[PDB]
Amino acid sequence: EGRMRVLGIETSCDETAVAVLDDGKNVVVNFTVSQIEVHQKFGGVVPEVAARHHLKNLPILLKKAFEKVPPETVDVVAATYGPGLIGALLVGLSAAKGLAISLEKPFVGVNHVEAHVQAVFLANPDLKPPLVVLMVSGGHTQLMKVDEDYSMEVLGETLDDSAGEAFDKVARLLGLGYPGGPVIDRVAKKGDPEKYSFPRPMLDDDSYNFSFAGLKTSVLYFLQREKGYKVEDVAASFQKAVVDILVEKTFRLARNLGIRKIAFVGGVAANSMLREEVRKRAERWNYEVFFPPLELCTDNALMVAKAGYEKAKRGMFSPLSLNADPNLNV
Amino acid sequence: EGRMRVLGIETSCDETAVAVLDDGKNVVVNFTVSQIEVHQKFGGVVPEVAARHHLKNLPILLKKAFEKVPPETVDVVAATYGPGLIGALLVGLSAAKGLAISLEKPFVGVNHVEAHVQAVFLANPDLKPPLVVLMVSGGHTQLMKVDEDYSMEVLGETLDDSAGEAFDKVARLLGLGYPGGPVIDRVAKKGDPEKYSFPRPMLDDDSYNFSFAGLKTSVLYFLQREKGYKVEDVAASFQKAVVDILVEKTFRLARNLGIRKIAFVGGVAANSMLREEVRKRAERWNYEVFFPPLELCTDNALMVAKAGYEKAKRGMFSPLSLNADPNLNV
Amino acid sequence: ASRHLRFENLTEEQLKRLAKILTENLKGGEVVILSGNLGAGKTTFVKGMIRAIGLDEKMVKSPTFTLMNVYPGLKTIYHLDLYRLQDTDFLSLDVEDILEDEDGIMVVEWGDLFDGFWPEDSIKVKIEIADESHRNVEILIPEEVNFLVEKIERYRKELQN
Amino acid sequence: ASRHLRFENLTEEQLKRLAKILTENLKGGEVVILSGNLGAGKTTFVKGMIRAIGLDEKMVKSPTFTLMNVYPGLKTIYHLDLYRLQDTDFLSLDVEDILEDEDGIMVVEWGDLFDGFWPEDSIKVKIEIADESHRNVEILIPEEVNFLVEKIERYRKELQN
Amino acid sequence: GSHMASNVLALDTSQRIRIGLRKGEDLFEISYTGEKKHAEILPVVVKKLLDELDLKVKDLDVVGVGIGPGGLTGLRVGIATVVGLVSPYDIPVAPLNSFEMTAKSCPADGVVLVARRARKGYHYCAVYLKDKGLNPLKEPSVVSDEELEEITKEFSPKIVLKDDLLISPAVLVEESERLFREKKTIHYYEIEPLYLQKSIAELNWEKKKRG
Amino acid sequence: GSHMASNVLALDTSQRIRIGLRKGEDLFEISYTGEKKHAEILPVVVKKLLDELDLKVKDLDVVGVGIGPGGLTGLRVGIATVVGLVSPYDIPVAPLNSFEMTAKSCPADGVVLVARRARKGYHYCAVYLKDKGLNPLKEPSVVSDEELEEITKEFSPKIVLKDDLLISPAVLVEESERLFREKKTIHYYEIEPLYLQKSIAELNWEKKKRG
Ligand SMILES: Nc1ncnc2c1ncn2[C@@H]1O[C@H](COP(=O)(O)OP(=O)(O)OP(=O)(O)O)[C@@H](O)[C@H]1O
Ligand SMILES: Nc1ncnc2c1ncn2[C@@H]1O[C@H](COP(=O)(O)OP(=O)(O)OP(=O)(O)O)[C@@H](O)[C@H]1O
Ligand SMILES: Nc1ncnc2c1ncn2[C@@H]1O[C@H](COP(=O)(O)OP(=O)(O)O)[C@@H](O)[C@H]1O
Ligand SMILES: Nc1ncnc2c1ncn2[C@@H]1O[C@H](COP(=O)(O)OP(=O)(O)O)[C@@H](O)[C@H]1O
Ligand SMILES: Nc1ncnc2c1ncn2[C@@H]1O[C@H](COP(=O)(O)OC(=O)O)[C@@H](O)[C@H]1O
Ligand SMILES: Nc1ncnc2c1ncn2[C@@H]1O[C@H](COP(=O)(O)OC(=O)O)[C@@H](O)[C@H]1O
Ligand SMILES: [Mg+2]
Ligand SMILES: [Mg+2]
Ligand SMILES: [Zn+2]
Ligand SMILES: [Zn+2]
């Protein structure tokens, strides 16, 4: 057994996460503070966790990790170093370099959005690039290409608000609460998606970039202009606008790059209307499409460990001098 | 040309010395403070030298050295690190390590008395050990063996006063002045060496060690006991006692070790009566004997550079951590 | 006492030019509190500001999720949005840390949600929706930083058009 | 005022035993000024002293040329001889440096040549030639180090023989 | 089993990087000052130091770490790297008060006041009676520029360590050893940084009043 | 040709080993304290430091060296190694007064007295008025324990640096730079150590009188 065991760390934003992964396949430990919270934890004889408290949380998860995984068995240490909050990135990054020195093991700095994409290859071990990925969570709205060697480019991003952010804010406007995506999805089901149009200065046809800020305000304008509409119809009509933008561009890119496989990752990829539209076009133009499971798409250290394993296999290790970069570009 | 150029430093006692030597043969620079002093030096636009002022002298000699010898041509740096005065050794040793770091060249720590012995091999390039060396200056009175590989042991030393020291002090007693060796040699010529005996507790027959303290006092006792002696006769009779001790032991050692070559180095080796006695026995028992020139026998950096070249050829280099040892044992 | 400046009925380009003029003249270590309802143009305002540090508007994203974006230009702009902030801890620590950066420019969407937290010399910018393509903008300049007043009033020149 | 102790007509072995008793009882940071003519037995005295630091007499050489010998035993003895010293510089620097060693024992042959230089608490030892095989020894113990007196006078026990 | 410390690593990242490493009779101090960020220096220097002294982390008897008060980014880097160092072996951790370390790093004795500027017109500060050990005359807190002057009169300003604080790495090692000998060390998952940062939320929520 | 310093090495061996190395925006400080002798440490640490910063000696713009007052053996090692460093390239040398360096290494300002014990009942000492720069109220000299007390009254003993002297390597680098900018540097063959040692010969040659 030339087994490569990789301990991943992720502290880029809100989630503190630690994972251990064997040969980019076998999950040993997959902890997030979200789980430790969202499950009860009456007091303790070991401190407690809270969201976005990376410095005090990470130690906790490491303790847990090492109880299940004896430290000397770790071969490579991997951590997110950007993009995100400098203050948060630094905790994961710095602890990881700590462990490398301590365990006399090599170290891998991982890009958060690249990591997210590994969810596709974790979930589809047989899947071979090239492929196109729509990454479309609350934080991230990005169109990416993965080529034969597993290099990644960003070919489109939001110029303002993410897709998830559009759902969240429009849901507030419709008085539906938070998170916006789910409630709108539910409420739209019983609504007419052709009822209303949402015209606004739309950006370039050829551009693979996104803009949602103007769609947000367009719905506001509508509410303070029109009389006697129904939420179902507004939600449905807005939802249609968003997925129409996302699907057109994603397939257009794939066509022009001559790629035949497309993957969708992140909260918004859950959307039932998006999934239908995607399958329709997939069928018609003969594309393979992939929708990873949801617990892989949310921030976690597994995607980091995978990203790390793949870089380590290729001997692409990071120096101990690696600074966190909040604006890291893939 | 696989030419090895060695810069030597010597600051073990009274003399500050710097030398440069090529392939253990070709002398490039051979400076001693003694020369810089014992030759006039009216003022200057570069500071002045004085005896035993190693810290301020050595810089001077280095300046001189580098004017004749461009520094980058130096291959190895060698310095005495013992035995001697810690305070003095340290200056040479520390500057030498300085130069090694500066020139990115290797460094060799040299033993002062071992170095003295290199005068024999500088002066007799064809000479091959084994040989026996009587080292017999003012500081040093030592019987040494050099074996085939050029290793050295001390097989006899003084247990009190050196030979030169006996001459110096007895000369004071006879009111002849300083240095004692020369004046006694001159004055003894016109004296009877059989006139007086100097009985005292003599140490072991088998021992290869020396003791002169008791011979010193024996002459004192004589002066305050006897009446109407002549200086010539006392000087001659004392001189006979000393060389008789030195020659008996030196040849006895050589015989028992089955060595057929003997070398004499140091001030006292100049003694005219010693040289005669040595040649007599050399002739009779068929020994080769060597008396190096006098400017090689006195403290200087050339013997150091030679000692260094020979260690460097054999890859026996010293670390930068090497401390001065006032009691260094060969 | 603090000096109030009203700009009525600005197009989007005009609102951005106004943000550029404000930011051009900031020395370093300043705080701008961006106030206004959903869709008022807070994020659009920051797209104006970044002109002044020699970057493209492309770089300015909504920090609703990221919480704070860093734009490193000729000066560094720290661009916060506190919309979705539930606790108070992130202000006490992370933001407090940047308030000790005396070279950067901090601009904070929805800063008014935590009105007590900000220094007295903070610049307040309130954006109202006038119609579908115009906004009104009110800027409060504290006395401590009063030199800005002359710089901003000079912009009214462009609006005579 | 300083206390004078005379020992008359000591053999060589007796002189060494006396030097051992002196040195045994030295705490550290002491100076012994060895006085006496050529051949009095100053160097022989030091051969006695070294018994007390657990080394062989073999190690004790004349420092006439070396100027200072170091004997590192249970305590370190610094053994100086100033016979051939022409300047004054070596005292001012090198010896002064060792006077700041508060753990070692300094013993100085011909120390009396530079009588002014030594601290007041210095122990003075004067050796006279009595005959060809006996010496007289006078030791001056300053008040500062007065505990030595009882230790040394106890040696007279051995001399009743 | 239970023995006295031989190998001691301590650092403080609260301002400048300060690293102390004792190994037997050998104590090495290292500091860095420049444009490079803590994350660029601290781990590399720690690794090089350990390597040159032929030391592995597991051979360490205690690790000291500064916990503030100080710069948030710095503290986070320092503490986090320490967590990475010790977590695999549960090596005990000496939490070091950066202001106390500052006070003890001052050659003189008497009454000492330590201050670091916060946001314009405010300062972290503490006052210490310092002789054999060191005793707190007022615990580290936040004050305004005016309220700072109140403190400089209310106590004797014998020494005033202001704004640029010298930390002797030797002192870090010494304090780490002391806490270890006093059984005051803690686990890597029990570290509680001095965040005074948090006090400005309440003191500036009104005006110049708090009682 | 003539440019301002970028690469600056300075050390002081007058008590503990203190090494400072600036290279551009990067300043590294190193100190050693332990049983090992200066000759065992100073050269190895200098070499390692230079190597890790990818620096050769010839690339140095100035070398600072402490010249005393201090321990003879230490000073000799330090100065001698520096001579070895610079001699091949005639790199300029900043002579550093170890007592001044001590004074400047003290965070506070005002009136400062520095003292090191000589032979029992005597002390090297100097008094310094210290604010922007530093001004000598009495130059380093030798005194008895009694005469030391005369000085502690005759001047204000605001800070008293006695016996165990902290030297900040940063301060060594800074002073080296200053002397270099003031064209006060010297050649390696012009170094003149402060040997106060030599004053005890005359002051103890009589009694308690000298005028
Ligand atoms: N005069 C105007 N000034 C600014 N923006 C305008 C104007 N007219 C129309 N708009 C449009 O209104 C939208 C405002 O979006 P923006 O995200 O900047 O508002 P916001 O206050 O940041 O929203 P949120 O409260 O969600 O942060 C943009 O699409 C912008 O192009
Ligand atoms: N009672 C005695 N005590 C000591 N030494 C004696 C005695 N009787 C004879 N001797 C001998 O006298 C000699 C004294 O030599 P030593 O070198 O010790 O004197 P010194 O004072 O050191 O001479 P210098 O003035 O040259 O240094 C030795 O050979 C010693 O063995
Ligand atoms: N990704 C795609 N793969 C295959 N066919 C597509 C794709 N996207 C659009 N099409 C088809 O092509 C049409 C638009 O381009 P079209 O008018 O066929 O010009 P051309 O095919 O020459 O580019 C659409 O109506 C659609 O039927
Ligand atoms: N180094 C020497 N080489 C040769 N012969 C020697 C040497 N030393 C002494 N002898 C001779 O040997 C004699 C002493 O030893 P000796 O009585 O011959 O016994 P043996 O020769 O059996 O050892 C001296 O009288 C001398 O003639
Ligand atoms: N069914 C959904 N339709 C549209 N949006 C949805 C749906 N489910 C979640 N979302 C949106 O994904 C976002 C959350 O994404 P995620 O938690 O995966 O990662 C980030 O936080 O970035 C939210 O904005 C939420 O409104
Ligand atoms: N001809 C001589 N006979 C006896 N001794 C002689 C003679 N010439 C010099 N010496 C002695 O050598 C000693 C000097 O040796 P040297 O100068 O070679 O080295 C040391 O200083 O150790 C002096 O004691 C001197 O009296
Ligand atoms: Mg916004
Ligand atoms: Mg003698
Ligand atoms: Zn993410
Ligand atoms: Zn010699």
UniProtKB/TrEMBL annotation, chains C, D:
It comes from the Bacteria. Mg(2+) binds at T43, E109. It is found in: Cytoplasm. ATP binds at L10, E12, G39, G41, K42, T43, T44, W110, S133. NCBIfam families: T6A_YjeE. Belongs to the TsaE family. This is tRNA threonylcarbamoyladenosine biosynthesis protein TsaE. It comes from Thermotoga maritima (strain ATCC 43589 / DSM 3109 / JCM 10099 / NBRC 100826 / MSB8). The lineage of its organism: Bacteria, Thermotogati, Thermotogota, Thermotogae, Thermotogales.
